[PDB]
Design an enzyme around this catalytic site. Structure first.
Site, PDB file in Angstrom:
ATOM      1  N   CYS A  18       0.802  -1.078  -0.206  1.00 33.30           N
ATOM      2  CA  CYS A  18      -0.011  -0.106   0.003  1.00 33.30           C
ATOM      3  C   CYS A  18       0.720   1.128   0.084  1.00 33.30           C
ATOM      4  O   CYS A  18       0.365   2.171  -0.099  1.00 33.30           O
ATOM      5  CB  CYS A  18      -0.909   0.001   1.112  1.00 33.30           C
ATOM      6  SG  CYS A  18      -0.170   0.412   2.740  1.00 33.30           S
ATOM      7  N   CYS A  21       4.537   1.173   3.914  1.00 36.44           N
ATOM      8  CA  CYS A  21       5.981   0.858   4.317  1.00 36.44           C
ATOM      9  C   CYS A  21       7.120   1.717   3.707  1.00 36.44           C
ATOM     10  O   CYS A  21       7.978   2.071   4.633  1.00 36.44           O
ATOM     11  CB  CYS A  21       6.455  -0.614   4.107  1.00 36.44           C
ATOM     12  SG  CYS A  21       5.300  -1.803   4.850  1.00 36.44           S
ATOM     13  N   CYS A 121       2.711  -7.861   5.144  1.00 38.96           N
ATOM     14  CA  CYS A 121       2.280  -8.351   3.961  1.00 38.96           C
ATOM     15  C   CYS A 121       3.466  -8.847   3.471  1.00 38.96           C
ATOM     16  O   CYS A 121       3.480 -10.340   3.220  1.00 38.96           O
ATOM     17  CB  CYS A 121       1.984  -7.268   2.995  1.00 38.96           C
ATOM     18  SG  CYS A 121       0.439  -6.252   3.267  1.00 38.96           S
ATOM     19  N   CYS A 159       2.277  -3.182  10.488  1.00 39.50           N
ATOM     20  CA  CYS A 159       1.726  -2.630   9.296  1.00 39.50           C
ATOM     21  C   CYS A 159       1.244  -1.056   9.777  1.00 39.50           C
ATOM     22  O   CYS A 159      -0.005  -0.713  10.130  1.00 39.50           O
ATOM     23  CB  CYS A 159       0.296  -3.499   8.962  1.00 39.50           C
ATOM     24  SG  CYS A 159      -0.625  -3.293   7.899  1.00 39.50           S
ATOM     25  N   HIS A 208       2.027  -6.083  26.312  1.00 33.20           N
ATOM     26  CA  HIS A 208       1.369  -6.111  27.284  1.00 33.20           C
ATOM     27  C   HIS A 208       2.125  -6.189  28.878  1.00 33.20           C
ATOM     28  O   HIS A 208       1.928  -5.496  29.902  1.00 33.20           O
ATOM     29  CB  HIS A 208       0.362  -7.498  27.482  1.00 33.20           C
ATOM     30  CG  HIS A 208      -0.459  -7.802  28.495  1.00 33.20           C
ATOM     31  ND1 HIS A 208      -1.499  -6.929  29.021  1.00 33.20           N
ATOM     32  CD2 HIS A 208      -0.294  -8.788  29.451  1.00 33.20           C
ATOM     33  CE1 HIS A 208      -1.944  -7.445  30.096  1.00 33.20           C
ATOM     34  NE2 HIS A 208      -1.235  -8.550  30.406  1.00 33.20           N
ATOM     35  N   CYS A 211       3.408  -2.879  29.558  1.00 32.90           N
ATOM     36  CA  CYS A 211       2.291  -1.834  29.337  1.00 32.90           C
ATOM     37  C   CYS A 211       1.923  -1.042  30.329  1.00 32.90           C
ATOM     38  O   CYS A 211       2.014  -1.503  31.692  1.00 32.90           O
ATOM     39  CB  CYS A 211       1.004  -2.478  28.852  1.00 32.90           C
ATOM     40  SG  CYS A 211      -0.219  -1.020  28.378  1.00 32.90           S
ATOM     41  N   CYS A 232      -7.514  -0.212  31.627  1.00 30.28           N
ATOM     42  CA  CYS A 232      -7.100  -1.012  30.546  1.00 30.28           C
ATOM     43  C   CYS A 232      -7.806  -1.083  29.418  1.00 30.28           C
ATOM     44  O   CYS A 232      -9.065  -0.929  29.405  1.00 30.28           O
ATOM     45  CB  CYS A 232      -6.728  -2.366  31.155  1.00 30.28           C
ATOM     46  SG  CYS A 232      -6.308  -3.879  29.843  1.00 30.28           S
ATOM     47  N   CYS A 238      -7.904  -4.561  22.829  1.00 28.46           N
ATOM     48  CA  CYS A 238      -6.459  -4.541  22.884  1.00 28.46           C
ATOM     49  C   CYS A 238      -5.858  -6.036  22.469  1.00 28.46           C
ATOM     50  O   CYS A 238      -6.154  -6.805  23.644  1.00 28.46           O
ATOM     51  CB  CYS A 238      -6.039  -3.716  24.069  1.00 28.46           C
ATOM     52  SG  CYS A 238      -4.083  -3.557  24.150  1.00 28.46           S
ATOM     53  N   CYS A 247       6.680  -0.761  20.979  1.00 34.58           N
ATOM     54  CA  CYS A 247       5.747   0.247  20.883  1.00 34.58           C
ATOM     55  C   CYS A 247       5.699   0.960  22.125  1.00 34.58           C
ATOM     56  O   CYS A 247       5.397   2.216  22.277  1.00 34.58           O
ATOM     57  CB  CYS A 247       4.755   0.015  20.195  1.00 34.58           C
ATOM     58  SG  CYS A 247       4.863  -0.826  18.606  1.00 34.58           S
ATOM     59  N   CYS A 259      -0.349   3.303  19.935  1.00 34.51           N
ATOM     60  CA  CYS A 259      -1.703   2.846  19.659  1.00 34.51           C
ATOM     61  C   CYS A 259      -2.666   2.431  20.998  1.00 34.51           C
ATOM     62  O   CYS A 259      -3.750   2.836  20.895  1.00 34.51           O
ATOM     63  CB  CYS A 259      -1.777   1.614  18.761  1.00 34.51           C
ATOM     64  SG  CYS A 259      -0.762   1.900  17.227  1.00 34.51           S
ATOM     65  N   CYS A 265      -4.153  -1.764  20.624  1.00 32.97           N
ATOM     66  CA  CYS A 265      -3.278  -2.360  19.863  1.00 32.97           C
ATOM     67  C   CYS A 265      -3.846  -3.526  18.909  1.00 32.97           C
ATOM     68  O   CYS A 265      -4.912  -4.171  19.583  1.00 32.97           O
ATOM     69  CB  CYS A 265      -1.971  -3.232  20.575  1.00 32.97           C
ATOM     70  SG  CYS A 265      -1.059  -4.207  19.741  1.00 32.97           S
ATOM     71  N   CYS A 268      -0.304  -5.797  14.826  1.00 32.89           N
ATOM     72  CA  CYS A 268      -0.040  -5.684  13.767  1.00 32.89           C
ATOM     73  C   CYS A 268       1.372  -6.196  13.078  1.00 32.89           C
ATOM     74  O   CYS A 268       1.544  -6.447  11.904  1.00 32.89           O
ATOM     75  CB  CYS A 268       0.067  -4.132  13.223  1.00 32.89           C
ATOM     76  SG  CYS A 268       1.403  -3.065  13.525  1.00 32.89           S
TER      77      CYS A 268
END
Ligand code: SF4
Ligand code: SF4
Ligand code: FCO
Ligand SMILES: [Cl-]
Ligand SMILES: [Fe+2]
Ligand code: NI
Ligand SMILES: [S]
Lengths: 283, 483
Positions: A18, A21, A121, A159, A208, A211, A232, A238, A247, A259, A265, A268
């Protein structure tokens, strides 16, 4: 880096991608994308940004590939569709012959130093391979293996991936190669990949378990609306518990958000994305 | 006089996605054209059977350049299908998320996709090799300004994505738009952060980008005299300015054969004679749309369907929106039109139909629109209320339908969803580059870009640079066009 330093040749081929990336890479902060392009790599073919076009661009890639046989890096963005004799992804035309993604990967794949499967992908099939698809969308490593091509593959999923995962994996590989040569260096890279082909510096820790809302999860304190940022996010969907990415610490887009803070989340970076992470908005 | 040369360009580069263009040149001009979108994924079938709420994530992966547009069309369609009533503050937050990507996308398009059509970059890949006679006319100083601005624009477009992510979570592929609104209430502190970034983007747009487009254009005045095509445009409306559904930053309208007309979406049909889809599916409005790939079908040449509006082949994008809405021109546009072109203009249509609907006119429209969007974002930053809720949490309906209409940076976008048994039964996308980069319809009428290529000069068949220059003025995104 320096403008006059050694910079390896890179070809960037888009299959069923798409362009996200590529765009995520444009967002690299340190080093900036200008520094990556002018000081780190030599991006010799990339359809979104390169100066030349058409058969001339294809022939330029072929000339560089011959000169640097065994030594160029091949980035793949998007999956490789095998149905209908490859016709669901045509990437160019030269010598009055169309070139499918299947053709291109069989041509350049065997002669790359390494293939970097950038994004979910390319790494795992992703959305183009998900339920309801009919193009035979195939992950890079599977396609290469099915066709007897032994070139090492490094998966950098997401992604999209975070730019730091892409640039950082390039930097890690180039450092290993500086210290050990190409074969020894790629061997050192392979040693730090998980069972899904992902570099452990970026994908070795679970979201997690690291987190900031883990205390709320353990207490059963769950947000019932997205805009409640105290609880949460598990009941909102999530997928942090099943996701291996950094992340929670690195965050996104210059550290301005991520996210889980913003929404949920969706897992991805995982090989089963999207179908194994769906529905997104229920546990 | 010279005879025929047929020229095929695959890949067309410095666009998004997979495009082949084939032109027939006779006596120094394009006399025929065919565009082929070359990569198919089939989102309209992948989406079936899913929880409808998943669509606002899945559909963004149509395109990582314009994902906020797909997010917006999807959540609007879901809002309608679910009966979700987006809170006022969530409407504004959505506008701030999406508006920031208009800035990103137009800056990306002009500098990182288009500018090398006119500017020679540094002597290393990906700026070389290129055509030996590339028709690069700028002085050493102006060329260097173009390169310096290309480099600065890499940082500016990245800052625009920070703006998107402040309330959108990340970019590409936002998390922050859902059915029912926006997932994160803006705080005072994060609104300061958005505004500080916005000021830097505004300064670049006003001081560098808009002036450079007019200045480069003044060295390529011949490029306002070609690329007219059908001179026909579509706008479906975008960026709601209140909660009524009737007032938008860009208001809808059609323009064709020299006349303004209303937009009635029931007049859209998608044809497939020249597209790789089953022949039984030709001529469907999107509410009854079907996506049945037929990659071996004789005579077809593209994975893009052929949308027509009451039989008309229309273009979309900044030119379309600015022509339909006719806003006042920017202060620097008015000044440079006078100083560099001898044109006295106050509003966009004062350029005249011929110059607006041209290769360079489309670049000018895009720069003008970027300036116009600055004022809209400034307004939303004054209108937003820190701390006020931005989302409702609606139950999934068993049976429903909805349509979301918006304007992606490249033009009109709609998503249609039908829900049955609480799952997606059909999902149809009619996107911007679908309107621009489509093939012939069942009657043989060309798509908008195919027609705009007619008359393009090719005085040197060994360096046919104007073919792709014309294509790039439309800012194609073939991944959007095909999905
Ligand atoms: S479920 Fe999500 S929000 Fe909750 S603690 Fe785990 S990763 Fe954090
Ligand atoms: S938080 Fe989850 S969905 Fe977001 S980028 Fe990280 S792994 Fe992907
Ligand atoms: N902008 C954008 Fe994408 C396209 N074409 C959509 O819709
Ligand atoms: Cl967008
Ligand atoms: Fe469609
Ligand atoms: Ni797009
Ligand atoms: S796009």
């Amino acid at each position: 880096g320096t403008l006059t330093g050694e910079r390896p040749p890179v070809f960037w081929l888009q299959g069923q991608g798409c362009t996200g990336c590529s765009v995520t890479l444009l967002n690299s902060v340190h080093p900036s994308i200008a520094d990556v392009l002018l000081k780190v790599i030599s991006l010799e073919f990339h359809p979104t940004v390169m100066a030349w076009e058409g058969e001339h661009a294809i022939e330029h890639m072929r000339k560089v590939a011959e000169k640097f046989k065994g030594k160029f890096f091949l980035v793949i963005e998007g999956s490789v569709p095998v149905e209908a004799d490859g016709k669901y992804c045509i990437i160019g035309e030269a010598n009055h012959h169309e070139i499918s993604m299947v053709d291109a990967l069989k041509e350049f794949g065997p002669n790359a130093a390494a293939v970097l499967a950038v994004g979910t992908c390319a790494a795992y099939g992703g959305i183009p391979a998900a339920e309801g698809s009919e193009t035979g969308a195939t992950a890079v490593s599977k396609f290469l293996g099915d066709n007897g091509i032994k070139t090492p593959v490094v998966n950098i999923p997401g992604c999209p991936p975070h730019p730091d995962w892409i640039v950082g994996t390039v930097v890690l590989a180039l450092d290993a190669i500086k210290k050990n040569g190409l074969e020894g260096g790629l061997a050192e890279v392979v040693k730090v990949l998980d069972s899904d082909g992902r570099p452990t510096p970026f994908f070795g820790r679970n979201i997690h378990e690291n987190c900031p809302y883990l205390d709320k999860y353990d207490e059963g304190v769950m947000s019932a609306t997205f805009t409640d940022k105290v609880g949460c996010r598990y009941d909102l969907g999530c997928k942090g518990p099943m996701t291996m990415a950094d992340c929670f610490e690195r965050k996104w887009n210059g550290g301005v958000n991520w996210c889980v803070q913003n929404a949920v989340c969706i897992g991805c970076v995982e090989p089963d994305f999207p179908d194994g992470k769906s529905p997104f908005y229920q546990a | 006089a010279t005879g025929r040369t047929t020229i095929a360009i695959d890949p067309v580069t410095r666009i998004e996605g997979h495009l082949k263009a084939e032109v027939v040149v006779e006596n120094g001009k394009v006399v025929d054209a065919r565009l082929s979108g070359g990569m198919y994924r089939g989102f309209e079938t992948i989406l079936r059977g899913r929880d409808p709420r998943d669509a606002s994530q899945i559909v963004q992966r149509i395109c990582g350049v314009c994902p906020t547009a797909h997010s917006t069309a999807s959540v609007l369609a879901l809002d309608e299908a679910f009966g979700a009533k987006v809170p006022n503050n969530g409407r504004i937050t959505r506008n701030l998320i999406f508006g920031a990507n208009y800035l990103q996308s137009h800056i990306l398009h002009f500098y990182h996709l288009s500018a090398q059509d006119f500017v020679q970059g540094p002597d290393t890949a990906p700026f070389v090799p290129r055509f030996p006679k590339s028709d690069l006319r700028l002085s050493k100083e102006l060329n260097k300004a173009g390169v310096d601005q290309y480099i600065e624009a890499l940082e500016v477009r990245r800052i625009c994505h920070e703006m998107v992510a402040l309330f959108g979570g990340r970019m590409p592929h936002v998390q922050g738009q859902v059915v029912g609104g926006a997932t994160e209430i803006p705080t005072k502190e994060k609104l300061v952060e958005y505004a500080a970034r916005f000021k830097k983007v505004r300064d670049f747009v006003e001081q560098k980008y808009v002036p450079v487009v007019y200045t480069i254009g003044s060295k390529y005045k011949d490029m306002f005299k070609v690329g007219q095509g059908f001179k026909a445009a579509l706008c479906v409306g975008a960026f709601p300015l209140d909660n009524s559904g009737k007032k938008h930053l860009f208001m809808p309208g059609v323009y064709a054969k020299g006349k303004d007309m209303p937009f009635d979406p029931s007049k859209i049909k998608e044809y497939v004679k020249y597209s790789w889809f089953a022949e039984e599916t030709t001529g469907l409005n999107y509410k009854e749309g079907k996506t049945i790939p037929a990659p071996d079908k004789a005579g077809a040449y593209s994975f893009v369907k052929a949308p027509r509006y009451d039989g008309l082949s229309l273009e979309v994008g900044p030119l379309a929106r600015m022509w339909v809405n006719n806003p006042e021109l920017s202060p620097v546009g008015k000044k440079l039109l006078k100083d560099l072109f001898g044109i006295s203009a106050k509003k966009f249509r004062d350029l005249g139909e011929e110059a607006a609907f041209s290769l360079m006119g489309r670049h000018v429209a895009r720069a003008e629109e970027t300036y116009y969007m600055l004022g809209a974002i400034e307004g939303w930053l004054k209108e937003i209320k820190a701390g006020e809720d931005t989302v409702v949490m609606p139950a999934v309906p068993a049976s429903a339908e909805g349509t979301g209409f918006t304007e992606a940076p490249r033009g009109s976008l709609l998503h249609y969803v039908k829900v049955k048994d609480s799952k997606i039964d059909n999902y149809q996308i009619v996107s911007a580059s679908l309107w621009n980069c489509n093939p012939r319809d069942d009657m043989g009428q060309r798509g908008a870009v195919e027609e705009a290529l007619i008359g393009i000069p090719v005085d040197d068949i060994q360096n046919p640079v104007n073919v792709a220059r014309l294509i790039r003025a439309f800012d194609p995104x073939l991944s959007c066009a095909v999905h």
